[PDB]
Curated annotation (Swiss-Prot):
It comes from the Eukaryota. It is a multi-pass membrane protein. Glycans are attached at residues 38, 55, 95. It catalyses: (6R)-L-erythro-5,6,7,8-tetrahydrobiopterin(out) + a dicarboxylate(in) = (6R)-L-erythro-5,6,7,8-tetrahydrobiopterin(in) + a dicarboxylate(out); L-erythro-7,8-dihydrobiopterin(out) + a dicarboxylate(in) = L-erythro-7,8-dihydrobiopterin(in) + a dicarboxylate(out); L-sepiapterin(out) + a dicarboxylate(in) = L-sepiapterin(in) + a dicarboxylate(out); prostaglandin F2alpha(out) + a dicarboxylate(in) = prostaglandin F2alpha(in) + a dicarboxylate(out). Glycosylated. Glycosylation is necessary for proper targeting of the transporter to the plasma membrane. This is Solute carrier family 22 member 6. InterPro entries: MFS_dom (IPR020846), MFS_sugar_transport-like (IPR005828), MFS_trans_sf (IPR036259), Orgcat_transp/SVOP (IPR004749). PROSITE patterns: MFS. GO terms for cellular component: basal plasma membrane; basolateral plasma membrane; caveola; plasma membrane; protein-containing complex. It comes from Rattus norvegicus. Highly expressed in kidney; in the particular segment of the proximal tubule. In kidney, found preferentially in the cortex and outer medulla and weakly in the inner medulla. Expressed to a lower extent in brain.
């Protein structure tokens, strides 16, 4: 087995530490890139600019007032103070907090407000495309080469977005940045796991969860330090140039070399790692014949998820769970400005709640089971979001606390569904099923900004939709079997025997 060779060349040695750390470091900026528009697309207060030929009755004589006494954002009087007209001459933006965003840069307000959400969706479209395209590319070219390309693409596209001369160019490059960043996240965990012993593989996924949580803190600090969107976009993008330079020194996974029919490449990688780990004597004992015997034994389709009636029910129910969790998650975390508290503080608190959420999810999963944990986390998240849509916006502390609880619950939902999905699918299709679940989540993050556009017509409709979907999904979990205390199924036959 390949695990025996890995233990022979050092187990979790110096090479594993160095390479895993270097590969995992860009996931710190992953959260910044995923939710950057909260700061780069922040919406400052705005109103119509008065006619140029007019002399400032003053500005108040030109602006109709809303029900709360504030000037209207999208209408001005045709004559100084009652015929209203849109902002023909543009808008005046309050620059006290956010001096420059893509909203102020390209006037993404009023009838053009939806372009802000379209840009977010196009980013998530790139994330979806990058998962599929670079998932195939990593298999043909290897994890190391694709990571090298992804770092360069992320650095170049993110920098180009910072220097975009118009909205269209910004969207194109944001989409390209999402393409490579999705591959970075996917191939970071594939490359690191393939170089780690099987009994340490769960720690790799756990460490990645801690890194993403730390990235939310990092975005808060960077955005607060760098308010200007062009500078902010640039500053989270150029670190990937550094990763691109040192990624050349990555060692491709010996397991991928063997699966590609290159044992001499497998041998060279293993001996290099043995040299780094101080196990040169063990590495010098390796040979193509030794590798051939060990990997002889080790060396279904996604359509079977729909062709098999037994696998179809699980796939459909899990797809709803994966979709809803992501759909509600990005519905909530991309609406930071809507809580009335400073977005930097909320971003900090949102990152902090991930840690107790995992601990509480860990406690519930092992005690009650995966199904009640998945049910409760989705149900409570939905209720929290739904109640947030009812409470008036003036109650900032209550609404923010509910949002934090809802965000923590959805983080627990993410933690449970990944573990639940693997124990639900048989070993023949488990990797395909986990990939299809992650795909459904990526679809949810595409749809979520689109639903957010409905706030233009009904201000509270997005929150109701973001809350209703997980509540419905919480009922879907009731159709799933409980996996706590069960052996992992191997074939679809095991699935039917378990049900019987």
């Amino acid at each position: 087995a390949f695990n025996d060779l890995l233990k022979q060349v050092g187990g979790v040695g110096r090479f594993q530490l160095i390479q895993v750390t270097m590969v995992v470091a860009p996931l710190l900026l992953m959260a910044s890139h995923n939710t950057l528009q909260n700061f780069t697309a922040a919406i400052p207060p705005h109103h119509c600019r008065p006619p140029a030929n007019a002399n400032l009755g003053g500005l108040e004589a030109w602006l109709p007032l809303d029900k709360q006494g504030q000037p209207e954002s999208c209408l001005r009087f045709t004559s100084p103070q009652r015929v209203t007209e849109p902002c023909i001459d543009g808008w005046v933006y309050d620059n006290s907090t956010f001096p420059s965003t893509i909203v102020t840069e390209w006037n993404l307000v009023c009838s053009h407000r939806a372009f802000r959400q379209l840009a977010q969706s196009l980013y998530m479209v790139g994330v979806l495309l990058g998962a599929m395209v670079f998932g195939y590319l990593a298999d043909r070219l290897g994890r190391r080469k694709v990571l090298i390309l992804n770092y360069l693409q992320t650095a170049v596209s993110g920098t180009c977005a910072a220097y975009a001369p118009n909205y269209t160019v910004y969207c194109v490059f944001r989409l390209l940045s999402g393409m490579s960043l999705a591959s970075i996240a996917i191939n970071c965990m594939t490359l690191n796991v393939e170089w780690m012993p099987i009994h340490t593989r769960a720690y790799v996924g756990t460490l990645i969860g801690y890194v993403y949580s730390l990235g939310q803190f990092l975005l808060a600090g960077i955005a607060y330090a760098v308010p200007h969107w062009r500078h902010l976009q640039l500053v989270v993008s150029v670190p990937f140039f550094i990763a691109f330079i040192y990624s050349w020194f990555f060692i491709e996974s010996a397991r991928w070399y063997s699966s590609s029919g290159r044992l001499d490449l497998t041998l060279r990688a293993l001996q290099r790692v043995a040299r780094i780990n101080g196990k040169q004597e063990e590495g010098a004992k390796l040979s193509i014949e030794v590798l051939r015997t060990s990997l002889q034994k080790e060396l279904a389709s996604a359509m079977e998820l729909l062709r098999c009636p037994t696998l179809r029910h699980l796939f459909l129910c899990l797809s709803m769970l994966w979709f809803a969790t992501s759909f509600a998650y990005y519905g909530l975390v991309m609406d930071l400005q809507g809580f009335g508290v400073s977005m930097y503080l909320i971003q900090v608190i949102f990152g902090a709640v991930d840690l107790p959420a995992k601990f509480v999810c860990f406690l519930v999963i092992n005690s009650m089971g995966r199904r009640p944990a998945q049910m409760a986390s989705l149900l409570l998240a939905g209720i929290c979001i739904l109640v947030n849509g009812i409470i008036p916006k003036s109650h900032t502390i209550i609404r923010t606390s509910l949002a934090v609880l809802g965000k923590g619950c959805l983080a627990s939902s993410f933690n449970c569904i990944f573990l639940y999905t693997g124990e639900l699918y048989p070993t023949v299709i488990r990797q395909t099923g986990l990939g299809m679940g992650s795909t459904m989540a990526r679809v949810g993050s595409i749809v979520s900004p689109l639903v957010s556009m409905t706030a233009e017509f009904y201000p509270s409709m997005p929150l109701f939709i973001f809350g209703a979907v997980p509540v419905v999904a919480s009922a879907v979990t009731a159709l799933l079997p409980e996996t706590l205390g069960q052996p992992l199924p191997d074939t679809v036959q095991d699935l039917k025997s378990r049900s019987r």
